[PDB]
């Protein structure tokens, strides 16, 4: 069974955006809790 | 006996269950108002008790140097054990393909959420420095300190938090199809769009149901180990300790069996009034009450087996401490708890074996109330009596509860009933789907004879 | 289409995204405040009663 | 323009229509029911749902994360002698419960969120609900919609094929 | 839409950098 | 941080001498030698609770 | 049915070979034969006790799986009276038959007179404290009483099921069996727990575990369920197992095997964490004996092969739906159950992993071969899948 | 150590790090033999109280001393339950005197004045041990011995 959104231009872009958001959040959190002191 | 009384239609199930919520505020029945007022008054008692506990400290209870754990832990275990029966009905019966879970899964699971909410306060309230509860949770700090992770209270933090989140997500997933029926029948533009956002445009259809059914089976499969693990961990803290009564190998399974047994009594006590007050007699039949009583009897016998194992362990070993534990349970200053325990959970369950007693609604209510008191007494016996007398005779003292821990107990009851009343006012008590699907399954069974 | 406009889909997805961003931002602000120089009084020349200069 | 709606009275009629469909090549169709029929479901939705792979992946990730968290926290970052308990892998008892709880938690979140996302569930607005009688679709009404995505879809022929069955109301659901 | 997600991410990044600078001001 | 890694901060006495002292480029080797000479205890002991708190 | 006869012949061959090597071991040393026999009886007893427990549990809770294996469970339960006769050699060891048959000392420490008598050369006080409860006459009487209860429940239930074929099966008989099963499940749990305590926990009187016995019931349940899956593959073609069966009973039995495997692991881990975390000298020795002289390797093998490998393999819808894959896992689980019980019983006597005798392997294979032969003899007495049953509708879904 | 009131002693909340126990055990019991035993924290190498502590307030020391950190303690009270000798005392209420200037002068600077919600136990007079350890290390470095 295909996903409902299969065959959409927006799928790769939304996945990318979610990954970029996540990476940014992770780096910022890491900096504050590990390197900011 | 059948689990569905004949003469039901998909429209009738939508209209009957749908009518309870969505009724105009000014048309709320007076019984609801009376019950909600009582629950709110007990909630005010809860607020006063918590405020004075925070102002003065945990010293207002009856706890002392030998008995460092008093009625706070007893009530925590009692409330957390109330929520096992609803999780069982929601998940294990789904795995077992039992057909009597359809009409009682929603109310039982709501009871589990509210009981977990009530029991989650005690770990913070009994803490002595309640505002430092976050220290148990791993969190980034400038100190570099960590939780021990080898104690059982660290396990409690992960078990209760996981249990609450999984129960909430499973309950919300079940409500998503029900929200879709409510938004369609809301009849007010503002009432609609509130159920509709919760429904998330469910638009029930094939290729949505197929994923929904698989996800529900997977969530039910994950929840069954989770609930057993939660109660086993709430039993490990006593078992890990070297205290003679506390360290018993049979504690984990016995505690799980006790939780289902106490929870089923609470579910029978609250479900029977809801069934009579609304026209839910067709949805919840006498067969549902009879099967629930049999499950309560089955788990009660395992609790009695746990007692027999404990007594055999006391008589088997030559340790002075096990023998004095038995003596203090039987002829000690707190023997009343043990005698009431033996009366309430062993003598009361024996009538359940007979079919006529299970069929009688008054008999079930009296036995369920006795079981609820007996389970509280069992927790009291396990904790307080064992803590009172220990290895060194010089460190022996008696535990006498004050009025403030009782005030907290009634306050938690009030909070629980307030949450139940708001739930029954706003959301449907009976799953609207999985009840018409039950009717579909029953009609198909009749066709194949 | 019954009770919602066409852009409700985008609005709901963006609301979820913004809620997650707001939770992360709140955590970050709390951590930064508790690790700030104003809170811990770092690099702040405290004025003295007699104005002694090392 | 989105599709054609059948509005069938009873689930048996919906099943019969779906069985008569998929025989003329009318693929890319859906059926709307208050409850899972389980006969319509396997007819037009057959295959892997996709949830179990995510459940397994995130459950294993959570269990590993919990174990690594306990190990790094209490045996590497700050080594603290507590009760004489070992500071090695022989401390594998008293490390199981956190691993199990983390695995269960992440598996449950993966199951729920994957079910919601794979269904494209957060859609308050849809081309459906433009049908006048779809309001009663969650309360005793059954429907069959053939999407415009179907390779052999033309408004006139699809409507006529739906009328070849006996439907209470054939509608043209638009965008 | 991806464009709005990226715009929100950039706004959140700017806010986070401002907060981080405010801490060490 | 310094109770655990004291070889990056230890200096050859003259600690009260005007703090115009700049650590040398080979701070690691000199720090290890000074840790060995002064007998600074390993992190097994310097990170105990009753070292600081009482 | 010819496959059933082949299974019976293979079981008989395994039995005669196992008894023959056990007899050769007895000639070299009587003591080694008796210690091996105790382990062999304990592992063999699981299939009949498990069959009785599942039969009563299925009567209480009607299921498609229960109707499919009801006749096979009845046949396995029916072998219980013969199992009681097999207990007689163990009884001779702890009675005054010692000093004869070549036994230097009584099989059980409580049986030895010096240990339980004041002024005795050893006179261990803890064993002496339990002398009335742990005495040869009392132990034999309780085990015999348990055998009578087990035999009566198994024979009465089988007789009612055979009667169901003749007449009055619509509500009568089915209700009667359900009622006998409900009282029986409570009697079965109490009798099995005490039987486990007397036969195995009493080997070392110094140690006692409350969870013990419940763990044996889980171990017996896994062994019987694995055995049922192996038998079902052999009887997959039998005509009544051709028009009256579907993938759903096989899938349900696979789910039950997975649940029993996780349940057994939970009970074993629960005992280990409580004893390990509460470091009390009284309960520490049992774990010390099972983690020394190579016993640690057997414990690691149980953790990996017995638990992780089945849990991952049975985590899929396929490998439980398919009978052949369910059979291969079921044979592996049975081998792991034999290893688990050897780890539970053998360290009491061997003291070293390399000290394990051929007789230790011989006694379980010979006794379980007798059990299989008797089971295959009994199951051919009556047709499978009793056609006259108000639950036959669950098989037609 | 704080002085609790008679009502607090009645509730068994007295705070004493060291206690002496009279066992009065003999034949007759009208003329028994009095036995006095002083009881204080045993500083057990394997300590049950440390294993049950969620926030790691109680951990061991390189020397072998049990370390109770008042600041870390969140007040759970699990450690007292798992202590076999029951030598741990908890501040259920604010026993310490904060409003009396003369009592504040009496308090020793080396040992912290505990607040409500923290457990207390015998610390083998850690302040004396720490002072001796610092003095021995200072003397060794000045000598250059590193002894
Ligand atoms: C001592 C520790 C005990 C650990 C207990 C482990 C067992 C609990 C497992 C959870 C249920 C998984 C069902 C999968 C599924 O839905 O299977 C379907 C078939 O569908 C598929 O093809 C695959 C589905 C994907 C499954 C992935 C699951 C994620 C990985 C697990 C991560 C675990 C955590 C801990 C890291 C059909 O199968 C079923 O649904 C049958 C369900 C049977 C319920 C088993 C109940 C467990 C009883 C023992 C529990 C003991 C206590 C101590 C926890
Ligand atoms: C409460 C906590 C622990 C639970 C432990 C047991 C594990 C339960 C989950 C596994 C489910 C297995 C798959 C489903 C199945 O095969 O059973 C369904 C069966 C038949 O149902 P039909 O398909 O025929 O539909 C009938 C109605 N339409 O339903 C049953 O009858 C239940 C089977 C019996 C359950 C056996 C568990 C016994 C628990 C023993 C506990 C021992 C404790 C020892 C200390
Ligand atoms: C090693 C061998 C195995 C030994 C196992 C021993 C332990 C077994 C315990 C079983 C307890 C069962 C209690 C009785 C429940 C009951 O009455 O059954 C009702 C049902 C529904 O069937 P219906 O409609 O009434 O009629 C069927 C015939 N038409 O069947 C069920 O089993 C589901 C009910 C819910 C199950 C409750 C038991 C859960 C036990 C949990 C505690 C476990 C402790 C570790
Ligand atoms: C032994 C493992 C411990 C434990 C359990 C704690 N510490 Fe320390 N500690 C030190 C300093 C300089 C501070 C002040 C931090 C600050 O001002 O920001 C602390 C503080 C703590 C706390 C915080 C208490 C609070 O109420 O906020 C805690 C919980 C704590 N410590 C626990 C210094 C040291 C040491 C210097 C060598 C070492 C060693 C320890 N602490 C050890 C511990
Ligand atoms: C690096 C510049 C350090 C900083 C930052 C802190 N301390 Fe320290 N400390 C340092 C050294 C090189 C030593 C000598 C260790 C030895 O065994 O000789 C110490 C020692 C202490 C001690 C005494 C240790 C003992 O065993 O008694 C104490 C009490 C101590 N340090 C306290 C302390 C505190 C509270 C600090 C944070 C404000 C701190 N030190 C920082 C080097 C450094
Ligand atoms: C519940 C989750 C945690 C929320 C914060 C709880 C503690 C906040 C607090 O106590 O602030 C006190 C601080 C000294 O007072 C302050 O420093 C001022 C606080 C500034 C804002 C910090 C919180 C922003 C929102 C946090 C959301 C998470
Ligand atoms: S507090 Fe009790 S258990 Fe802990 S070290 Fe002291 S005497 Fe031992
Ligand atoms: S359990 Fe720990 S949190 Fe404090 S009261 Fe005891 S040291």
Distance CA(G91)–CA(B212), nearest Å, equals 59
Strands H119-120 and H89-90: antiparallel
Distance CA(D102)–CA(D63), nearest Å, equals 6
Is H78 a known ligand-binding residue? yes
Q: Which of G266, G276, G299 to mutate to test the interface with D (most CBs of D within 10 A)?
A: G276
User: Does the beta carbon of H79 sit less than 6 angstroms from any atom of ligand 8?
Assistant: yes
CA-based torsion, G50, G54, G57, G59: positive or negative:
negative
Q: Which residues in chain B have their CB less than 8 angstroms from residue G213's CB? A: 309
Distance CA(B155)–CA(B135), nearest Å, equals 13
Distance CA(G323)–CA(B406), nearest Å, equals 58
User: Does the beta carbon of C26 sit less than 6 angstroms from any atom of ligand 6?
Assistant: yes
CB atoms within 10 A of CB D139: 19
Q: Which residues in chain B have their CB less than 8 angstroms from residue H92's CB? A: 57-59, 63, 128
Biggest CA pair distance of chain A: 50
Query: For residue G282, which of B318, B325, B387 has the smallest C-alpha distance?
Result: B318
Contact G216/G334 with Cβ under 8 angstroms?
A: no
Tokens 């396997």 identify what position? Answer: D42
Distance CA(G325)–CA(D133), nearest Å, equals 50
Residues 6+ away with beta carbon under 8 Å from G267: B253, G211, G214, G215, G218
Chain D, 75 to 104: residues with Cβ < 8 Å from chain G are 93-94, 96
Contact G14/G369 with Cβ under 8 angstroms?
A: yes
Distance CA(D94)–CA(D96), nearest Å, equals 6
Contact G279/G287 with Cβ under 8 angstroms?
A: no
User: Does the beta carbon of H72 sit less than 6 angstroms from any atom of ligand 4?
Assistant: yes
Helix ranges restricted to H, B317-435: 320-331, 335-342, 355-359, 361-380, 386-388, 403-426
> In Å, how far from its chain's centre is CA B141?
35
Q: Residue of the nearest CA to atom 22 in ligand 6? A: C30
**DSSP SS3 for H20:** strand
Percent helix / strand / coil, chain C, rounded to 5: 55, 0, 45
CB atoms within 10 A of CB G187: 15
B51-66 as b/e: b if 16+ CB within 10 A: eebeeebbbbbbbbbb
Sheet of D29-32, strand order = D29-32, D143-147, D3-5, D171-173
Chain G contact for B301 (CB, 8 A cutoff): yes
User: Does the beta carbon of H82 sit less than 6 angstroms from any atom of ligand 8?
Assistant: no
Query: For residue G385, which of G393, G373, G377, G374 has the smallest C-alpha distance?
Result: G393
Q: What are phi and psi of B66, to 5 degrees?
A: -70, -50
Q: Give me G298's structure tokens.
A: 């057997």
Tokens 């009582």 identify what position? Answer: B38
Q: Give me H113's structure tokens.
A: 């004045």
Q: Give me H114's structure tokens.
A: 């505990």
CB atoms within 10 A of CB D92: 14
Distance CA(G162)–CA(G70), nearest Å, equals 12
- Neighbours, chain D (3 or more CB pairs < 8 A): A, B, C, G, H
Query: For residue G196, which of G226, G218, G225 has the smallest C-alpha distance?
Result: G218
Secondary structure element (H or E) that encloses residue D145, with its range: strand D143-147
Residues 6+ away with beta carbon under 8 Å from D25: D152
Taken as a whole, chain C contains a residue count of 54
Distance from the alpha carbon of residue B229 to the mean position of ligand 1, in angstroms: 13
**DSSP SS3 for H67:** strand
Contact G77/G158 with Cβ under 8 angstroms?
A: yes
What's the Rg (C-alpha) of chain G?
A: 22
Q: What are phi and psi of G212, to 5 degrees?
A: -60, 145
Contact A3/B207 with Cβ under 8 angstroms?
A: no
Helix (DSSP H) and strand (DSSP E) numbers for chain A: 1, 0
Out of C5, C7, C12, the one facing D122 most closely (by C-beta) is C12
CB contact under 8 A, B242 and G280: yes
Contact G266/B232 with Cβ under 8 angstroms?
A: yes
Helix (DSSP H) and strand (DSSP E) numbers for chain D: 5, 4
Taken as a whole, chain A contains a residue count of 37
Q: In terms of C-beta density within 10 A (0-12 exposed, 13-18 middle, 19 or more buried), how is residue B233 classed?
A: buried
Extended strands (E) in G291-392: none
Contact B380/B62 with Cβ under 8 angstroms?
A: no
Q: Which residues in chain G have their CB less than 8 angstroms from residue D56's CB? A: 315
Distance CA(B84)–CA(B167), nearest Å, equals 11
Taking CA atoms, B211 is separated from B105, D11, D49, G378, in Å, by: 20, 20, 6, 46
Give the position, in ligand 1's atom list, of the atom nearest the Cα of D100.
Answer: 35
Out of A1, A4, A33, the one facing B140 most closely (by C-beta) is A33
Give the position, in ligand 1's atom list, of the atom nearest the Cα of D52.
Answer: 25
Helix ranges restricted to H, chain D: 11-20, 40-44, 51-71, 96-118, 155-164
Distance CA(G141)–CA(D165), nearest Å, equals 77
H with B: 3 or more CB pairs under 8 Å? yes
CB atoms within 10 A of CB D77: 12
Contact B387/H81 with Cβ under 8 angstroms?
A: yes
User: Does the beta carbon of B295 sit less than 6 angstroms from any atom of ligand 3?
Assistant: yes
Distance CA(D65)–CA(D46), nearest Å, equals 34
Residues 6+ away with beta carbon under 8 Å from G19: G366
C36-43, Cβ contacts within 8 angstroms, sequence gap of 24 or more? C36/E22, C36/E23, C36/E24, C37/E23, C37/E24, C37/E25, C38/E25
Chain C contact for D135 (CB, 8 A cutoff): yes
Contact D174/D167 with Cβ under 8 angstroms?
A: no
Contact C8/D124 with Cβ under 8 angstroms?
A: yes
Residues 6+ away with beta carbon under 8 Å from B198: B175, B176, B179
Q: Which of A8, A9, A28 to mutate to test the interface with E (most CBs of E within 10 A)?
A: A28
> In Å, how far from its chain's centre is CA H18?
8
Tokens 């694995």 identify what position? Answer: G226
CB contact under 8 A, C4 and B183: no
User: Does the beta carbon of H71 sit less than 6 angstroms from any atom of ligand 4?
Assistant: yes
User: Does the beta carbon of D103 sit less than 6 angstroms from any atom of ligand 1?
Assistant: yes
> Counting one residue from F and one from H, how many pairs have CB atoms under 8 Å apart?
38
Contact B239/B386 with Cβ under 8 angstroms?
A: no
Distance CA(B172)–CA(B116), nearest Å, equals 16
Phi-psi region of H86 (alpha: psi -120 to 50; beta: other; left: phi over 0): left
Q: In terms of C-beta density within 10 A (0-12 exposed, 13-18 middle, 19 or more buried), how is residue B369 classed?
A: middle
List the binding residues of C for heme c.
40, 54
* Shortest Cα–Cα distance, C45 to chain E (Å): 14
DSSP letters, G24-65, are HHHHH-HHHHHHHHHHHHHHHHHHHHHHHHHHHHHHHS--HH
**DSSP SS3 for B391:** coil
Distance from the alpha carbon of residue G35 to the mean position of ligand 2, in angstroms: 37
DSSP state of D142: B
CB atoms within 10 A of CB D46: 10
D with B: 3 or more CB pairs under 8 Å? yes
Q: In terms of C-beta density within 10 A (0-12 exposed, 13-18 middle, 19 or more buried), how is residue B442 classed?
A: middle
Give the position, in ligand 7's atom list, of the atom nearest the Cα of H58.
Answer: 4
Distance CA(G226)–CA(G43), nearest Å, equals 14
Query: For residue D141, which of D49, D14, D44 has the smallest C-alpha distance?
Result: D14
Q: Which residues in chain C have their CB less than 8 angstroms from residue A33's CB? A: 31
User: Does the beta carbon of H55 sit less than 6 angstroms from any atom of ligand 8?
Assistant: yes
Tokens 């739930």 identify what position? Answer: B423
CB contact under 8 A, D94 and G277: yes
Taking CA atoms, G377 is separated from A22, E10, G72, G77, in Å, by: 66, 78, 11, 13
Out of B236, B313, B318, the one facing G273 most closely (by C-beta) is B236
Distance CA(B390)–CA(G87), nearest Å, equals 43
3-state secondary structure B211-233: HHHHHHHHHHHHHHHHHHHHHHH
Q: Give me G357's structure tokens.
A: 């005798």
CB contact under 8 A, B251 and G129: no
Distance CA(B365)–CA(B267), nearest Å, equals 10
Q: Which of A1, A34, A36 to mutate to test the interface with B (most CBs of B within 10 A)?
A: A1
Q: In terms of C-beta density within 10 A (0-12 exposed, 13-18 middle, 19 or more buried), how is residue B18 classed?
A: buried
Q: Which residues in chain A have their CB less than 8 angstroms from residue C28's CB? A: 28-29, 32
Distance CA(H50)–CA(H80), nearest Å, equals 10
Q: Give me G106's structure tokens.
A: 């009584």
Query: What method did the depositors use to determine the structure?
Result: cryo-EM
CB contact under 8 A, H130 and F48: no
Query: For residue G169, which of G250, G65, G70 has the smallest C-alpha distance?
Result: G70
3-state secondary structure B143-159: CCCCCCCCCHHHHHHHH
Q: Residue of the nearest CA to atom 46 in ligand 1? A: G259
DSSP letters, F2-41, are TTT-GGGT---S--SS-TT----TTHHHHHHHHHHHHTPP
Contact E25/C37 with Cβ under 8 angstroms?
A: yes
Distance CA(D131)–CA(C2), nearest Å, equals 9
CA angle G289, B326, G109 (to 5 degrees): 35
Taken as a whole, chain B contains a residue count of 449
Q: Residue of the nearest CA to atom 14 in ligand 4? A: B143
The DSSP bridge partners found for residue H58 are: H68
Q: Residue of the nearest CA to atom 6 in ligand 2? A: G259
Contact G192/G213 with Cβ under 8 angstroms?
A: yes
Query: For residue A3, which of D47, G206, B365 has the smallest C-alpha distance?
Result: D47
Tokens 């495997």 identify what position? Answer: G261
DSSP state of H89: E
**DSSP SS3 for B57:** coil
DSSP letters, G251-317, are HHHHHHHHHHHHHHHHHHHHHHHHHHHS--TTTHHHHHHHTSTTHHHHHHHIIIIIIIHHHHHTTSS
Out of A1, A4, A5, the one facing D47 most closely (by C-beta) is A1
Q: Give me F14's structure tokens.
A: 């003259």
- Neighbours, chain C (3 or more CB pairs < 8 A): A, B, D, E
Distance CA(G374)–CA(G393), nearest Å, equals 31
Query: For residue H42, which of H81, H91, H80, H84 has the smallest C-alpha distance?
Result: H84
Contact A1/D48 with Cβ under 8 angstroms?
A: yes
Q: Give me H16's structure tokens.
A: 């004493």
């Amino acid at each position: 069974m295909q996903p409902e959104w299969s065959g959409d231009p927006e799928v790769k872009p939304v996945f990318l955006a979610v990954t970029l958001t996540g990476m940014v959040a992770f780096l910022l959190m890491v900096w504050l809790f590990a390197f900011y002191w | 006996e059948a689990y569905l009384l004949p003469g039901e239609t998909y429209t009738s199930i939508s209209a009957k269950i749908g009518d309870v919520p969505l009724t105009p505020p000014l048309k709320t029945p007076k019984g609801w108002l009376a019950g909600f007022s009582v629950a709110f008054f007990m909630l005010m008692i809860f607020f006063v008790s918590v405020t004075w506990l925070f102002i003065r400290g945990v010293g207002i209870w009856g706890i002392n140097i030998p008995v460092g754990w008093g009625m706070d832990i007893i009530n925590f275990v009692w409330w957390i054990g109330i929520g096992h029966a609803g999780t069982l009905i929601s998940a294990i019966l789904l795995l077992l393909n039992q057909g009597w879970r359809n009409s009682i899964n929603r109310f039982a699971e709501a009871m589990t959420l509210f009981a977990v909410a009530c029991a989650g306060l005690y770990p913070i309230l009994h803490l002595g420095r309640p505002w430092l509860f976050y220290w148990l949770i791993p969190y980034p700090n400038t100190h570099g300190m960590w939780p021990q992770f080898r104690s059982a209270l660290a396990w409690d933090v992960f078990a209760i938090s996981t249990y609450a989140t999984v129960s909430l997500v499973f309950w919300l997933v079940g409500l998503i199809p029900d929200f879709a029926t409510l938004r369609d029948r809301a009849k007010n533009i503002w009432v609609k769009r509130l159920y509709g956002i919760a429904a998330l445009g469910w638009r029930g259809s094939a290729r949505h149901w197929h994923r929904y059914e698989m996800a529900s089976i997977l969530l039910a499969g994950l929840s069954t180990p989770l609930v057993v693990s939660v109660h086993s961990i709430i039993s490990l803290d006593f078992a890990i300790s070297q205290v003679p009564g506390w360290q018993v190998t049979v504690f984990p399974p016995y505690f799980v069996a006790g939780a289902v047994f106490a929870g089923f009594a609470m579910v029978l006590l609250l479900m029977i009034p809801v069934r009579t007050f609304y026209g839910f007699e067709n949805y919840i039949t006498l067969h549902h009450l009879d099967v629930m009583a049999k499950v309560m009897l089955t788990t009660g016998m395992i609790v009695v087996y746990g007692y027999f194992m404990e007594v055999f362990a006391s008589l088997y070993s030559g340790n002075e401490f096990e023998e004095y534990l038995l003596y203090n349970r039987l002829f000690g200053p707190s023997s009343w708890a043990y005698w009431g325990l033996l009366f309430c959970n062993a003598v009361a369950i024996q009538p359940l074996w007979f079919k006529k007693v299970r069929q009688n609604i008054p008999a079930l209510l009296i036995i369920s109330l006795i079981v609820s008191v007996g389970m509280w007494l069992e927790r009291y016996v396990i904790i307080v009596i064992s803590l009172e007398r220990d290895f060194l005779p010089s460190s022996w003292d008696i535990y006498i509860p004050t009025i403030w821990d009782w005030s907290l107990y009634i306050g938690t009851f009030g909070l629980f009933f307030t949450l139940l009343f708001l739930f029954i006012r706003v959301l449907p008590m009976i799953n609207i789907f999985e009840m018409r699907l039950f009717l579909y399954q029953e009609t198909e069974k009749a066709k194949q004879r | 289409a019954q009770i919602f406009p066409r852009n409700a889909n985008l609005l709901s997805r963006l609301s979820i995204f913004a809620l997650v961003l707001l939770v992360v931002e709140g955590i970050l602000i709390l951590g930064v405040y508790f690790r700030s120089n104003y809170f811990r009084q770092v690099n702040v020349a405290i004025e003295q009663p007699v104005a002694f200069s090392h | 323009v989105y599709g054609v709606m059948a509005e069938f009275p009873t689930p048996e009629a919906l099943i019969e229509a779906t069985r008569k469909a998929k025989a003329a090549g009318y693929t890319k169709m859906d059926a709307f029911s208050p409850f899972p029929i389980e006969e319509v479901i396997e007819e037009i939705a057959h295959g892997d749902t996709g949830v179990p792979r995510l459940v397994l992946l995130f459950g294993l990730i959570g269990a590993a994360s919990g174990f690594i968290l306990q190990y790094i926290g209490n045996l590497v970052d700050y080594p603290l002698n507590v009760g004489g308990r070992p500071l090695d892998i022989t401390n594998w008892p008293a490390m199981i419960p956190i691993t199990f709880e983390s695995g269960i938690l992440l598996a449950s979140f993966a199951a729920a969120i994957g079910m919601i996302v794979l269904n494209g569930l957060p859609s308050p607005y849809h081309p459906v609900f433009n049908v006048p009688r779809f309001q009663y679709a969650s309360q005793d009404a059954f429907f069959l919609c053939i999407e415009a995505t179907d390779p052999l879809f033309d408004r006139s022929r699809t409507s006529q094929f739906l009328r070849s069955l006996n439907p209470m109301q054939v509608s043209e659901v638009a965008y | 839409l991806s464009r709005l997600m990226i715009a929100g991410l950039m706004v959140f990044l700017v806010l986070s950098l401002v907060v981080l600078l405010a801490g060490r001001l | 941080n310094c109770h655990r890694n004291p070889e990056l901060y230890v200096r050859p006495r003259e600690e009260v001498y005007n703090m115009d002292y700049v650590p040398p480029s080979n701070q690691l080797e000199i720090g290890r030698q000074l840790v060995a000479e002064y007998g600074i205890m390993p992190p097994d002991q310097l990170t105990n609770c009753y070292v600081c708190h009482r | 049915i010819p496959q059933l006869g082949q299974v019976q012949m293979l079981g008989l061959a395994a039995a005669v070979i196992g008894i023959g090597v056990l007899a050769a071991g007895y000639f070299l040393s009587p003591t080694s034969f008796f210690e091996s026999y105790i382990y062999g009886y304990y592992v063999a007893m699981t299939i009949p006790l498990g069959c009785l427990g599942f039969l009563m549990v299925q009567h209480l809770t009607g299921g498609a799986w229960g109707v499919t294996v009801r006749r096979m469970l009845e046949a396995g339960a029916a072998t219980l009276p013969i199992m009681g006769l097999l207990f007689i050699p163990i009884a001779l060891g702890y009675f005054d038959t010692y000093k004869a048959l070549g036994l230097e000392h009584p099989l059980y420490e409580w049986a030895n007179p010096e240990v339980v008598t004041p002024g005795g050369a050893e006179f261990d006080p803890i064993i002496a404290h339990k002398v009335p409860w742990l005495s040869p006459l009392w132990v034999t009487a309780r085990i015999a009483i348990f055998f009578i209860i087990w035999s009566a429940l198994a024979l009465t239930l089988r007789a009612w099921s055979r009667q169901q074929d003749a007449g009055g099966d619509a509500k009568k008989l089915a209700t009667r069996m359900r009622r006998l099963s409900g009282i029986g499940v409570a009697l079965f749990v109490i009798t099995v727990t005490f039987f486990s305590f007397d036969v195995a926990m009493s080997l070392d009187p110094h140690w006692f575990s409350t969870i013990y016995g419940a763990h044996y019931m889980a171990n017996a349940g896994l062994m019987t369920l694995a055995f049922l899956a192996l038998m079902m593959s052999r009887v997959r073609d039998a005509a009544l197992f051709r028009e009256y069966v579907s993938v759903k009973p096989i899938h349900d039995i696979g789910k039950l095997i997975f649940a029993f495997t996780v349940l057994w692991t939970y009970m074993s881990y629960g005992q280990l964490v409580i004893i390990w975390s509460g470091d009390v000298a009284e309960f520490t020795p049992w774990y010390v004996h099972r983690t020394q002289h190579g016993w640690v390797f057997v414990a690691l093998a149980l953790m990996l092969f017995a638990f992780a490998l089945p849990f991952f393999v049975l985590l899929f819808r396929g490998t439980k739906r398919n009978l052949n894959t369910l059979a291969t896992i079921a044979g592996w689980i049975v081998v792991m159950r034999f290893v688990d019980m050897a780890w539970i019983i053998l360290p009491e006597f061997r003291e070293h992993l390399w000290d394990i005798a051929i007789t230790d392997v011989a006694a379980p294979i010979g006794l379980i071969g007798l059990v299989i032969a008797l089971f295959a003899a009994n199951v051919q007495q009556a047709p499978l899948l009793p056609l006259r049953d108000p639950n036959m509708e669950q098989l037609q879904n | 150590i704080a002085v609790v009131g008679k009502d607090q002693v009645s509730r068994g909340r007295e705070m004493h790090w060291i206690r002496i126990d009279r066992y009065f055990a003999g034949e007759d019991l009208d003329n028994p033999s009095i036995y006095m035993m002083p009881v204080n924290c045993m500083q057990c190498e394997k300590a049950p109280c440390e294993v049950v502590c969620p926030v790691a307030a109680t951990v061991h020391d390189y020397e072998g001393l049990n370390n109770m950190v008042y600041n870390r303690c969140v007040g759970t009270k699990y450690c007292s339950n798992n202590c076999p000798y029951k030598v741990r005392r908890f501040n259920f209420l604010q026993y310490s005197d904060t409003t009396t200037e003369t009592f504040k002068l009496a308090f020793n600077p080396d040992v912290t004045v505990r607040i409500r919600g923290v457990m207390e136990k015998c610390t083998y007079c850690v302040q004396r041990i720490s002072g001796a350890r610092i003095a021995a290390k200072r003397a060794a470095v000045q000598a250059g011995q590193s002894s």
